[PDB]
Write an enzyme that holds these catalytic residues in place. Sequence first.
Site, PDB file in Angstrom:
ATOM      1  N   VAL A  67       0.802  -1.222   0.000  1.00 37.21           N
ATOM      2  CA  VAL A  67       0.000   0.000   0.000  1.00 37.21           C
ATOM      3  C   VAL A  67       0.833   1.269   0.000  1.00 37.21           C
ATOM      4  CG1 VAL A  67      -2.026  -1.082   1.046  1.00 37.21           C
ATOM      5  CG2 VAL A  67      -0.296   0.050   2.510  1.00 37.21           C
TER       6      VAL A  67
ATOM      7  N   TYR B 270       3.956   5.827  16.362  1.00 41.18           N
ATOM      8  CA  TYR B 270       2.758   5.028  16.137  1.00 41.18           C
ATOM      9  C   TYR B 270       1.516   5.780  16.573  1.00 41.18           C
ATOM     10  CZ  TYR B 270      -0.532   1.110  16.373  1.00 41.18           C
ATOM     11  OH  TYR B 270      -1.592   0.237  16.250  1.00 41.18           O
TER      12      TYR B 270
ATOM     13  N   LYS C 204      -1.922   7.058  14.331  1.00 38.91           N
ATOM     14  CA  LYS C 204      -3.296   6.634  14.566  1.00 38.91           C
ATOM     15  C   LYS C 204      -4.187   7.820  14.925  1.00 38.91           C
ATOM     16  CE  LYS C 204      -2.864   2.188  13.637  1.00 38.91           C
ATOM     17  NZ  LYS C 204      -3.609   1.632  12.504  1.00 38.91           N
TER      18      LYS C 204
ATOM     19  N   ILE D 185      -5.663  -6.743  20.582  1.00 40.12           N
ATOM     20  CA  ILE D 185      -6.184  -7.881  19.830  1.00 40.12           C
ATOM     21  C   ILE D 185      -5.051  -8.891  19.645  1.00 40.12           C
ATOM     22  CG2 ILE D 185      -7.445  -8.595  17.758  1.00 40.12           C
ATOM     23  CD1 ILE D 185      -8.948  -6.458  19.387  1.00 40.12           C
TER      24      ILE D 185
HETATM   25  N1  LIG Z   1      -3.163  -6.163  17.238  1.00 42.65           N
HETATM   26  C1  LIG Z   1      -3.602  -5.145  18.014  1.00 42.65           C
HETATM   27  O1  LIG Z   1      -3.690  -5.231  19.239  1.00 42.65           O
HETATM   28  C2  LIG Z   1      -3.981  -3.854  17.344  1.00 42.65           C
HETATM   29  C3  LIG Z   1      -4.550  -2.884  18.159  1.00 42.65           C
HETATM   30  C4  LIG Z   1      -4.980  -1.686  17.612  1.00 42.65           C
HETATM   31  C5  LIG Z   1      -4.821  -1.466  16.269  1.00 42.65           C
HETATM   32  N2  LIG Z   1      -4.253  -2.412  15.495  1.00 42.65           N
HETATM   33  C6  LIG Z   1      -4.096  -2.139  14.009  1.00 42.65           C
HETATM   34  O2  LIG Z   1      -4.710  -3.182  13.302  1.00 42.65           O
HETATM   35  C7  LIG Z   1      -4.042  -3.343  12.030  1.00 42.65           C
HETATM   36  C8  LIG Z   1      -3.672  -4.799  11.829  1.00 42.65           C
HETATM   37  O3  LIG Z   1      -2.825  -5.161  12.945  1.00 42.65           O
HETATM   38  P1  LIG Z   1      -2.434  -6.678  13.267  1.00 42.65           P
HETATM   39  O4  LIG Z   1      -2.182  -6.835  14.712  1.00 42.65           O
HETATM   40  O5  LIG Z   1      -3.408  -7.564  12.618  1.00 42.65           O
HETATM   41  O6  LIG Z   1      -1.040  -6.806  12.507  1.00 42.65           O
HETATM   42  P2  LIG Z   1      -0.302  -7.993  11.736  1.00 42.65           P
HETATM   43  O7  LIG Z   1       1.108  -7.575  11.655  1.00 42.65           O
HETATM   44  O8  LIG Z   1      -0.613  -9.300  12.451  1.00 42.65           O
HETATM   45  O9  LIG Z   1      -0.967  -8.037  10.302  1.00 42.65           O
HETATM   46  C9  LIG Z   1      -0.756  -6.914   9.423  1.00 42.65           C
HETATM   47  C10 LIG Z   1      -0.856  -7.392   7.998  1.00 42.65           C
HETATM   48  O10 LIG Z   1      -0.657  -6.242   7.142  1.00 42.65           O
HETATM   49  C11 LIG Z   1       0.283  -6.584   6.147  1.00 42.65           C
HETATM   50  N3  LIG Z   1       0.965  -5.373   5.713  1.00 42.65           N
HETATM   51  C12 LIG Z   1       1.940  -4.684   6.389  1.00 42.65           C
HETATM   52  N4  LIG Z   1       2.487  -3.716   5.696  1.00 42.65           N
HETATM   53  C13 LIG Z   1       1.814  -3.759   4.483  1.00 42.65           C
HETATM   54  C14 LIG Z   1       1.927  -2.997   3.301  1.00 42.65           C
HETATM   55  N5  LIG Z   1       2.831  -2.028   3.119  1.00 42.65           N
HETATM   56  N6  LIG Z   1       1.092  -3.291   2.282  1.00 42.65           N
HETATM   57  C15 LIG Z   1       0.204  -4.286   2.437  1.00 42.65           C
HETATM   58  N7  LIG Z   1       0.008  -5.076   3.494  1.00 42.65           N
HETATM   59  C16 LIG Z   1       0.857  -4.765   4.488  1.00 42.65           C
HETATM   60  C17 LIG Z   1       1.216  -7.590   6.797  1.00 42.65           C
HETATM   61  O11 LIG Z   1       1.977  -8.328   5.836  1.00 42.65           O
HETATM   62  C18 LIG Z   1       0.217  -8.423   7.608  1.00 42.65           C
HETATM   63  O12 LIG Z   1      -0.345  -9.487   6.848  1.00 42.65           O
HETATM   64  C19 LIG Z   1      -2.887  -2.337  12.025  1.00 42.65           C
HETATM   65  O13 LIG Z   1      -3.318  -1.114  11.415  1.00 42.65           O
HETATM   66  C20 LIG Z   1      -2.662  -2.088  13.509  1.00 42.65           C
HETATM   67  O14 LIG Z   1      -2.104  -0.795  13.711  1.00 42.65           O
HETATM   68  C21 LIG Z   1      -3.840  -3.589  15.996  1.00 42.65           C
HETATM   69  C1  LIG Z   2      -0.052  -4.573  18.847  1.00 37.96           C
HETATM   70  N1  LIG Z   2       0.226  -3.561  19.864  1.00 37.96           N
HETATM   71  C2  LIG Z   2      -0.841  -2.687  20.109  1.00 37.96           C
HETATM   72  C3  LIG Z   2      -1.505  -2.688  21.353  1.00 37.96           C
HETATM   73  C4  LIG Z   2      -2.581  -1.844  21.630  1.00 37.96           C
HETATM   74  C5  LIG Z   2      -2.976  -0.971  20.622  1.00 37.96           C
HETATM   75  F1  LIG Z   2      -4.014  -0.148  20.867  1.00 37.96           F
HETATM   76  C6  LIG Z   2      -2.308  -0.948  19.393  1.00 37.96           C
HETATM   77  O1  LIG Z   2      -2.716  -0.090  18.428  1.00 37.96           O
HETATM   78  C7  LIG Z   2      -1.248  -1.805  19.099  1.00 37.96           C
HETATM   79  C8  LIG Z   2       1.117  -3.937  20.889  1.00 37.96           C
HETATM   80  C9  LIG Z   2       1.473  -5.257  21.119  1.00 37.96           C
HETATM   81  C10 LIG Z   2       2.339  -5.577  22.168  1.00 37.96           C
HETATM   82  C11 LIG Z   2       2.830  -4.566  22.978  1.00 37.96           C
HETATM   83  C12 LIG Z   2       2.424  -3.261  22.716  1.00 37.96           C
HETATM   84  C13 LIG Z   2       2.864  -2.097  23.494  1.00 37.96           C
HETATM   85  C14 LIG Z   2       2.371  -1.768  24.770  1.00 37.96           C
HETATM   86  C15 LIG Z   2       2.833  -0.620  25.451  1.00 37.96           C
HETATM   87  C16 LIG Z   2       3.783   0.227  24.863  1.00 37.96           C
HETATM   88  C17 LIG Z   2       4.246  -0.108  23.593  1.00 37.96           C
HETATM   89  O2  LIG Z   2       5.171   0.667  22.959  1.00 37.96           O
HETATM   90  C18 LIG Z   2       3.797  -1.246  22.933  1.00 37.96           C
HETATM   91  F2  LIG Z   2       4.296  -1.495  21.712  1.00 37.96           F
HETATM   92  N2  LIG Z   2       1.591  -2.957  21.688  1.00 37.96           N
END
Ligand SMILES: NC(=O)c1ccc[n+]([C@@H]2O[C@H](COP(=O)([O-])OP(=O)(O)OC[C@H]3O[C@@H](n4cnc5c(N)ncnc54)[C@H](O)[C@@H]3O)[C@@H](O)[C@H]2O)c1
Ligand SMILES: CN(c1ccc(F)c(O)c1)c1cccc(-c2cccc(O)c2F)n1
Lengths: 253, 253, 253, 253
Positions: free
Chosen positions: B60, B151, B155, B184
């Site tokens: 992307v 980060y 967001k 998540i």
């Molecule tokens: N996991 C959490 O707790 C959490 C919390 C809040 C927000 N998010 C957001 O949710 C989204 C997904 O997170 P996740 O935990 O599933 O991550 P993940 O790393 O498990 O999955 C992300 C996916 O996006 C793909 N990706 C990364 N860069 C890309 C690019 N340039 N082009 C296309 N695809 C690309 C990766 O290859 C991967 O398959 C992210 O925007 C993350 O910021 C996650």
């Molecule tokens: C996947 N991710 C995350 C968690 C919550 C969110 F809302 C979000 O957008 C992303 C993670 C995963 C593991 C640890 C931590 C994390 C926690 C406290 C300070 C940090 O710097 C971190 F990186 N964060």
Amino acid sequence: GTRYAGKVVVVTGGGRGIGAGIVRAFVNSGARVVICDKDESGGRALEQELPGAVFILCDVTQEDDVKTLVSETIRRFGRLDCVVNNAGHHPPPQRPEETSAQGFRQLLELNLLGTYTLTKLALPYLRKSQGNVINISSLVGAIGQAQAVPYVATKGAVTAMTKALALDESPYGVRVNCISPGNIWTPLWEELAALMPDPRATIREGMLAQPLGRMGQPAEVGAAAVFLASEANFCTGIELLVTGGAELGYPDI
Amino acid sequence: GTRYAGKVVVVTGGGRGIGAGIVRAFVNSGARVVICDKDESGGRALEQELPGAVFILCDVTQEDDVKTLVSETIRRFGRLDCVVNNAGHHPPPQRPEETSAQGFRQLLELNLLGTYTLTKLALPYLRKSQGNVINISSLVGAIGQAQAVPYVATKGAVTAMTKALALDESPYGVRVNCISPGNIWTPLWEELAALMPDPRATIREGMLAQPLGRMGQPAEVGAAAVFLASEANFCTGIELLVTGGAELGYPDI
Amino acid sequence: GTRYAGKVVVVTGGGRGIGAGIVRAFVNSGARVVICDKDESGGRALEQELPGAVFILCDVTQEDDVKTLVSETIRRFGRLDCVVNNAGHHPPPQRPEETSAQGFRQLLELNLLGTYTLTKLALPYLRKSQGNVINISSLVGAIGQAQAVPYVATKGAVTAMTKALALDESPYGVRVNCISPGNIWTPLWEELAALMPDPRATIREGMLAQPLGRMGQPAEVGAAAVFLASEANFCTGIELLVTGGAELGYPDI
Amino acid sequence: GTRYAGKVVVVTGGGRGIGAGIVRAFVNSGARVVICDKDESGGRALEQELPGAVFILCDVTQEDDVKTLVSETIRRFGRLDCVVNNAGHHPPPQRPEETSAQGFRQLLELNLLGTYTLTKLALPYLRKSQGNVINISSLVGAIGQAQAVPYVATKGAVTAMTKALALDESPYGVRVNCISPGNIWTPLWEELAALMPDPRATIREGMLAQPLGRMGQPAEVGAAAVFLASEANFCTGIELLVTGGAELGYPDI
Ligand SMILES: NC(=O)c1ccc[n+]([C@@H]2O[C@H](COP(=O)([O-])OP(=O)(O)OC[C@H]3O[C@@H](n4cnc5c(N)ncnc54)[C@H](O)[C@@H]3O)[C@@H](O)[C@H]2O)c1
Ligand SMILES: CN(c1ccc(F)c(O)c1)c1cccc(-c2cccc(O)c2F)n1
Ligand SMILES: NC(=O)c1ccc[n+]([C@@H]2O[C@H](COP(=O)([O-])OP(=O)(O)OC[C@H]3O[C@@H](n4cnc5c(N)ncnc54)[C@H](O)[C@@H]3O)[C@@H](O)[C@H]2O)c1
Ligand SMILES: NC(=O)c1ccc[n+]([C@@H]2O[C@H](COP(=O)([O-])OP(=O)(O)OC[C@H]3O[C@@H](n4cnc5c(N)ncnc54)[C@H](O)[C@@H]3O)[C@@H](O)[C@H]2O)c1
Ligand SMILES: NC(=O)c1ccc[n+]([C@@H]2O[C@H](COP(=O)([O-])OP(=O)(O)OC[C@H]3O[C@@H](n4cnc5c(N)ncnc54)[C@H](O)[C@@H]3O)[C@@H](O)[C@H]2O)c1
Ligand SMILES: CN(c1ccc(F)c(O)c1)c1cccc(-c2cccc(O)c2F)n1
Ligand SMILES: CN(c1ccc(F)c(O)c1)c1cccc(-c2cccc(O)c2F)n1
Ligand SMILES: CN(c1ccc(F)c(O)c1)c1cccc(-c2cccc(O)c2F)n1
Ligand SMILES: OC[C@H]1O[C@@H](O)[C@H](O)[C@@H](O)[C@@H]1O
Ligand SMILES: OC[C@H]1O[C@@H](O)[C@H](O)[C@@H](O)[C@@H]1O
Ligand SMILES: OC[C@H]1O[C@@H](O)[C@H](O)[C@@H](O)[C@@H]1O
Ligand SMILES: OC[C@H]1O[C@@H](O)[C@H](O)[C@@H](O)[C@@H]1O
Ligand code: NA
Ligand code: NA
Ligand code: NA
Ligand code: NA
């Protein structure tokens, strides 16, 4: 006249508008102020006008300009207590399809990364003085604005970054807060209105967008900044709204 | 099985984690789904697993990849109804002084500008279908997070940009909303925890950060996305929290 | 010493705690202050201590007490510029099933309706002076608190009522704002902690709930109130957080 | 037709307006629904119309009516999974000085305490079923409204109470969420508009207050409620906005 006596403050974009209002408010509180601006005209005159303020030419998008701004502040005044990241710009109204990734990158450089860079370079000195950071964000980061996708995104980033840095610097005694102004009557406001078909109507509409029925003044943002620096010792990570109530208040197919 | 029948959905970062959960939820609702990812492994397997989903390799951050993603979606399926901007990354914990402007720019390219670019290229087709945009932001854009200044800033920008674009596209019948997940359980979460001194303790702490006492699942984010696309016809510009209550709740010198 | 010179301020619950801090801050700004409290002990001593402050016994739940408070303020000082609605109470921790509708009604009488009644009786005079209202709400109205359903509800009501009244009084030049404190070290805090199995642990936990690592002081709430009254002329309907960052920041089954 | 099969739902104020929309949405999801209302006309007809819905006359301000509502729900259907606290009222526009403490108390009885009472009586059964609570608050609790101080206060209280109870019931697996609608076209909306000098203009203004250019429908609030009950298993303490974007978006003396 003494609320912030003996302290040293840097205000970016301090040569006109909100920035100049903030400069004046800090000088009136007893502080020494460094006016940073990319343009010489307003800031140089402000230095001549105000005992206690000096002007340093500095473009906040240029890392070496900012390094010199900090080193010259320390060399000249021996300490740094507060950094007000006010420099920023609002482009003319742009429909989403008329924006570009490159224009968006450029606006991020100013409105977001310039704030980031000065804050980073200043933090070692702010830690020594238990000083604080004040970022000038915008109400529209919180509620949105029409025909301003890039601008709104930059201000959402500033408000969020303020909260993150507040968390990171809390153990070291450095507070990090932001002010989100609404419609403030400044040269930028006047410039944007002049681009409109009916500038007078645009301005009238801007005044009426607030329950208070007028736009705000730079001096009012300045008083909020002095409060945050000098008296808000238990506030960190806050967003202080200076908007005149614009965010308040307001067949099925 | 019919809530979103006959519709076409693009999910970025759909090969694993939240993205894959969203893909599955839309397929289960009757939609055809294009899985976009920069990595082939997960998305290719998901295409073989799910009738109704296909995989297109697309980074992307690369504008020409995204142009082709949209043109191939239209060529293959004849319409586009929903774009889920899920691709993104969280770097390891970084103290503010350990971040760099260049690292910040790179993270903005992915988490913010990639969302911007796909949305821009998709909007002409979403207007034709009265479709909608769903951005995956984060709770930490709203409340902050430690050791994550870049980060968090990205967001905050996504959430704010969502509101701006909602305003701009409302006259054309295109809704624009975001989901802000909290913790998540995904491969990114597992990867970040593995970098910590005690990964087990980090995970336990992550579960306990929610009043519900567990982390969320990709399927739960997926159900929220299907709701926003298929049933939330009076919602635009909202931030839908999927956080398990993490934002709730909690000598003088 | 002159920021609010010549002005007259009423502070409810001014005999101890946050209220007394607000009284002191206004006296130090040059104002004359009427200390309202239902209990004589603290407020009477404060009147003897502070030139410029006087004490009037008044229970804000008793409409005739409040009528007399306003009429005596006008009779004695000739004007009224600011009303600080600080009187309120937090009951001990109560599980939802241990609360009662009658206890909830009683807490609404104090925390919500007492604020409503004084504001209503004061508004004709505040209109004449272009004065302002400051309500003391709570952070927990915004984010919730455990074992406090009635208290949290009352504070959510105060914050919302502040915004409504700000809209209604804006045409008349009367600003209406609130302060939402977090953990402030006061006699109420000390009393609630004394009810706990380990009061020392409860207090330590209260200090650690803020990124700043301490509880707040009445004087800090007082400085925020003086700012809102005397310098925040473009702020109406705001919620000013004085919380030390408590609201910031933070397997799947 | 199966998303909430086998579940039992109580909807207060279910005889018309939003409540009736919520009843229909739950019946369409496969649930059995108890329609509670103080008036017989609409709810009795709805019971005849919908297999799966029954009507129980109950005034939520009368504790013994609510006790019987719960006991009859359990006696007739053997379980209780979801309580939708929708009963409420908006008085005509009232300037602050035209309101009374007694009118305010009466509105609190309905909009706040009726929600509190049913929730309290239902929680033992919701714990057994791992059920959930949905409160119908209002956008104006968050942003304010003109000429509505009591109403706005009640809705601020409901939104805050939702968060508090979410915290308290999280250990027991009971989620507690709220929906904050904006302008929804209902008989209450039609009744209030009929009181205005130009009802047609009032309605047109109501439609134009949303970026989407129309008011919302009861069915749209109903779909949001079904989502919260049946698919939002990681959401607790949220405020789900169903407002059409009304909260988005918008010389110095
Ligand atoms: N996991 C959490 O707790 C959490 C919390 C809040 C927000 N998010 C957001 O949710 C989204 C997904 O997170 P996740 O935990 O599933 O991550 P993940 O790393 O498990 O999955 C992300 C996916 O996006 C793909 N990706 C990364 N860069 C890309 C690019 N340039 N082009 C296309 N695809 C690309 C990766 O290859 C991967 O398959 C992210 O925007 C993350 O910021 C996650
Ligand atoms: C996947 N991710 C995350 C968690 C919550 C969110 F809302 C979000 O957008 C992303 C993670 C995963 C593991 C640890 C931590 C994390 C926690 C406290 C300070 C940090 O710097 C971190 F990186 N964060
Ligand atoms: N005026 C409003 O209504 C309003 C509302 C909300 C937020 N804001 C924000 O307030 C800030 C000031 O706005 P304003 O209306 O006073 O604008 P302005 O254009 O009147 O003044 C901005 C000043 O910043 C300087 N500046 C610009 N780019 C710079 C750079 N690269 N390096 C150094 N200085 C630079 C300019 O030369 C100018 O002196 C901006 O961040 C703006 O986004 C303004
Ligand atoms: N202390 C905190 O951490 C904290 C946090 C957030 C909000 N608050 C709010 O701040 C306000 C003050 O709290 P505090 O900690 O200083 O409490 P406190 O109990 O120490 O002081 C409250 C004062 O109000 C007076 N008062 C009580 N009922 C009254 C009535 N009916 N009429 C007149 N006066 C009355 C009391 O006699 C007392 O002097 C309250 O509204 C409280 O909800 C406190
Ligand atoms: N209509 C809107 O634009 C709007 C916007 C935001 C919030 N709301 C909220 O949505 C809810 C429903 O509003 P509406 O527009 O459908 O109203 P409505 O007046 O059309 O319907 C309300 C229903 O509740 C019933 N009811 C009233 N008092 C009751 C009591 N004591 N016991 C039992 N039932 C009772 C009424 O008889 C009626 O059937 C209310 O809480 C209202 O505050 C409405
Ligand atoms: C200075 N500026 C502004 C206003 C409010 C803010 F919160 C803010 O951060 C900046 C201006 C000035 C003139 C017109 C407009 C403006 C209005 C509606 C859509 C737009 O695209 C605009 F540009 N905005
Ligand atoms: C004074 N007060 C308080 C604290 C913070 C606020 F924002 C607020 O408005 C009041 C106290 C004091 C001691 C303990 C607790 C407290 C903590 C957790 C659950 C509860 O039920 C509590 F009572 N609260
Ligand atoms: C149904 N209702 C309403 C509207 C929006 C909400 F968010 C809400 O909770 C209720 C109505 C209906 C008609 C007119 C007005 C109304 C508008 C402006 C000031 C007032 O005092 C009003 F009463 N409000
Ligand atoms: O240009 C609009 C306004 O800008 C402000 O910054 C100045 O202080 C005003 O004098 C001027 O009228
Ligand atoms: O790797 C952590 C988790 O990631 C999720 O995306 C997968 O659905 C789970 O099966 C896995 O346990
Ligand atoms: O009782 C706790 C604290 O209450 C505050 O209101 C007082 O100013 C302090 O002196 C005291 O230690
Ligand atoms: O009275 C206004 C509207 O109220 C809604 O509850 C009904 O579903 C509509 O049929 C009606 O037009
Ligand atoms: Na000078
Ligand atoms: Na497939
Ligand atoms: Na005295
Ligand atoms: Na029936």
